[PDB]
Amino acid sequence: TNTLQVKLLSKNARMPERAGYDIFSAETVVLEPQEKAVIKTDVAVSIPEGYVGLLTSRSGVSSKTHLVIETGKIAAGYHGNLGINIKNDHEDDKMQTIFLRNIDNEKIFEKERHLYKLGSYRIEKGERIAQLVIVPIWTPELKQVEEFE
Amino acid sequence: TNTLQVKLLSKNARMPERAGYDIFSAETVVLEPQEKAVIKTDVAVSIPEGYVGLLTSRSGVSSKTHLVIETGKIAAGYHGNLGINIKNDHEDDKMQTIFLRNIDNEKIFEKERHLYKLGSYRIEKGERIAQLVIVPIWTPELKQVEEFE
Amino acid sequence: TNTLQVKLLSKNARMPERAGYDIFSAETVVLEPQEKAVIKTDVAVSIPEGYVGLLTSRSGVSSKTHLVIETGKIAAGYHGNLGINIKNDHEDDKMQTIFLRNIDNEKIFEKERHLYKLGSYRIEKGERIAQLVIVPIWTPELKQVEEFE
Numbered sequence: 001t002n003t004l005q006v007k008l009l010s011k012n013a014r015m016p017e018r019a020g021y022d023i024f025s026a027e028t029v030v031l032e033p034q035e036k037a038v039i040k041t042d043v044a045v046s047i048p049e050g051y052v053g054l055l056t057s058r059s060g061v062s063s064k065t066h067l068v069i070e071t072g073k074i075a076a077g078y079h080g081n082l083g084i085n086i087k088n089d090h091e092d093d094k095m096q097t098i099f100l101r102n103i104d105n106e107k108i109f110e111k112e113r114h115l116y117k118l119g120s121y122r123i124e125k126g127e128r129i130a131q132l133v134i135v136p137i138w139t140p141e142l143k144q145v146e147e148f149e
Numbered sequence: 150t151n152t153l154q155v156k157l158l159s160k161n162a163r164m165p166e167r168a169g170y171d172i173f174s175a176e177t178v179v180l181e182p183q184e185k186a187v188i189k190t191d192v193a194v195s196i197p198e199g200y201v202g203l204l205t206s207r208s209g210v211s212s213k214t215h216l217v218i219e220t221g222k223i224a225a226g227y228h229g230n231l232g233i234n235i236k237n238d239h240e241d242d243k244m245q246t247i248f249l250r251n252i253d254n255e256k257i258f259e260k261e262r263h264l265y266k267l268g269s270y271r272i273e274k275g276e277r278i279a280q281l282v283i284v285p286i287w288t289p290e291l292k293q294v295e296e297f298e
Numbered sequence: 299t300n301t302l303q304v305k306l307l308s309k310n311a312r313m314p315e316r317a318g319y320d321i322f323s324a325e326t327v328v329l330e331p332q333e334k335a336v337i338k339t340d341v342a343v344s345i346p347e348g349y350v351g352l353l354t355s356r357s358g359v360s361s362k363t364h365l366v367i368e369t370g371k372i373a374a375g376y377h378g379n380l381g382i383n384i385k386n387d388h389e390d391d392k393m394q395t396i397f398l399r400n401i402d403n404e405k406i407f408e409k410e411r412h413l414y415k416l417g418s419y420r421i422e423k424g425e426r427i428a429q430l431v432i433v434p435i436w437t438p439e440l441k442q443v444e445e446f447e
């Protein structure tokens with residue numbers, strides 16, 4: 001029908017909301033400068049054939065922070081946990097600071113002061129970090145050709 | 150109809166040209182190694198429903214330079230100024246040089262010699278830095294599901 | 299018809315395979331930390347009008363390695379050699395190691411021990427490094443407008 005199925009794999013998951021669908025983190029993580037990771041959404045979707053999903057970066061977080069989301073391509077009928085392919089592309093300049101930075105590049109004040117690497121970010125459980133955009137995909141048969149028509 | 154509306158927000162803006170639409174800068178800026186920014190196009194568009202716009206990187210500039218454009222997703226019926234989400238991902242190696250580099254990685258000769266950080270780029274007002282690609286988006290209603298069909 | 303033409307430009311090329319089409323390298327290359335490059339596929343395609351191709355990153359390699367593929371936008375009816383726009387975004391920390399890393403971040407054991415820069419990768423001729431995803435593109439005529447409807 002004209003409806004997309006969504007399964008919540010955990011009590012940490014969070015239903016998407018709408019043009020593109022806001023995707024939420026299911027875990028709290030701390031990324032150091034240049035650290036890679038795959039953030040679990042604990043959400044799965046059943047995209048019908050003739051469609052590919054795009055788990056792509058959000059504009060707010062991406063423009064404001066060094067959090068770089070490589071757009072994931074959700075294949076039609078892939079039912080696994082959707083993971084955010086992320087890298088804190090902030091330069092590892094060896095410096096230190098007492099402040100983590102949220103997904104709005106603002107400092108997180110700590111009641112218990114800790115020492116962090118400069119350019120570190122914290123993603124909180126249930127935060128809007130990505131979004132899902134579904135678009136039609138064309139799958140034709142391939143033809144080995146010596147020269148095009 | 151079969152026509153996309155385009156509004157010029159400034160005397161610095163520049164009409165797009167065509168497969169994908171060439172987007173022009175409306176400002177001259179200088180990005181240091183690892184500097185983030187949002188370059189204003191001074192251009193706005195009214196994308197109809199059932200379509201999402203993609204303000205994505207150009208092939209020439211992106212392959213030739215360290216100028217990294219995170220593809221923007223222009224939602225159907227967003228009428229604001231389109232901004233290029235960019236980062237000069239060149240490593241900040243602390244070195245210095247007398248040359249800025251254009252969007253073709255070539256050196257810019259300065260009649261008035263200045264000291265710049267190595268790996269700096271200059272985007273000129275009215276230069277082709279990005280392009281707009283519009284594609285159909287699918288928006289179905291979401292259904293909370295315990296298991297897929 | 300309902301068929302996409304594919305031409306092999308070399309004896310090093312390799313036919314794509316299928317949701318998205320797996321793209322193979324036609325050359326063996328070694329990328330140092332922060333090195334840019336355009337990897338030749340030795341493959342050309344004739345995408346019909348009303349469609350744009352997306353030479354985008356693979357999930358395995360991209361999430362596992364620092365190999366960053368800026369998604370290429372293959373315009374309808376572009377018949378040139380498809381090249382992978384890549385950057386080894388691993389930080390140039392000046393360190394050295396005897397191991398190259400494959401597209402699975404695993405160490406490559408060398409029978410002839412050599413000295414490499416830490417965070418270097420090797421792409422092998424005939425490896426799955428990218429994939430092609432074709433989606434419909436909308437090309438309307440542009441209208442200069444003082445205010446939207």
Ligand SMILES: O=c1ccn([C@H]2C[C@H](O)[C@@H](COP(=O)(O)NP(=O)(O)OP(=O)(O)O)O2)c(=O)[nH]1
Pocket residue numbers: 055070071072073074075078081082083084085317318355356357358429
């Ligand atoms: O960022 C991502 C990327 C992929 N994925 C999922 C969706 C997709 O079904 C799967 C990998 O598909 P890709 O086409 O992106 N890469 P791969 O070539 O490994 O998949 P396949 O071999 O099935 O084409 O992993 C994510 O959840 N997040």
Ligand SMILES: O=c1ccn([C@H]2C[C@H](O)[C@@H](COP(=O)(O)NP(=O)(O)OP(=O)(O)O)O2)c(=O)[nH]1
Pocket residue numbers: 019020057058059060131204219220221222223224227230231232233234
């Ligand atoms: O690079 C960009 C990214 C976004 N934009 C614009 C277009 C879009 O309408 C708006 C942000 O939409 P996104 O879906 O990209 N992110 P966000 O989640 O913040 O928007 P919304 O909350 O409306 O979904 O900003 C740009 O001009 N350039």
Ligand SMILES: O=c1ccn([C@H]2C[C@H](O)[C@@H](COP(=O)(O)NP(=O)(O)OP(=O)(O)O)O2)c(=O)[nH]1
Pocket residue numbers: 168169206207208209280353368369370371372373376379380381382383
């Ligand atoms: O990563 C890439 C990017 C582009 N290409 C090819 C496909 C495309 O037809 C051509 C460049 O088209 P783009 O729209 O990506 N950039 P450009 O503005 O230079 O092309 P045009 O001026 O024709 O719009 O180069 C690749 O093979 N790999």
Ligand code: NI
Pocket residue numbers: 071220369
């Ligand atoms: Ni993209």
Ligand code: NI
Pocket residue numbers: 089238387
């Ligand atoms: Ni970097």
